[PDB]
């Protein structure tokens, strides 16, 4: 018998200096660490594309 | 007798379109024609330049 052994998770921080596991959910409980004002986003595509 | 002819002031659009003569009341009145989500400075300065 060989022994396995175990490693703990590692927590990565969002908001606040909260730390959770999942990324997803530690951003929809939480939010990102660091908040940005907006995207101005910019396409570059076909008409079908755009829309 | 020299006459002189009077050219009226013009005048620029601000948000919505409205209209106004002077960039200094009209933008404290109405509001810039695009607005930005916001603005992310950058420094480039000593210490006492930052403060």
């Given at each position: 018998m060989k022994?396995?052994?175990?490693?703990h998770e590692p927590?990565?921080?969002f908001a606040?200096?909260?730390?959770?596991?999942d990324p997803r959910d530690g951003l929809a409980l939480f939010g990102p660490?660091?908040?940005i004002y907006g995207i101005?986003?910019?396409?570059?595509?076909?008409?079908?594309?755009?829309?």
């Open positions: 022994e396995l052994i175990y490693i927590n990565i921080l606040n200096g909260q730390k959770c596991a660490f660091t908040k101005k986003s910019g396409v570059v595509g076909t008409q079908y594309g755009l829309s």
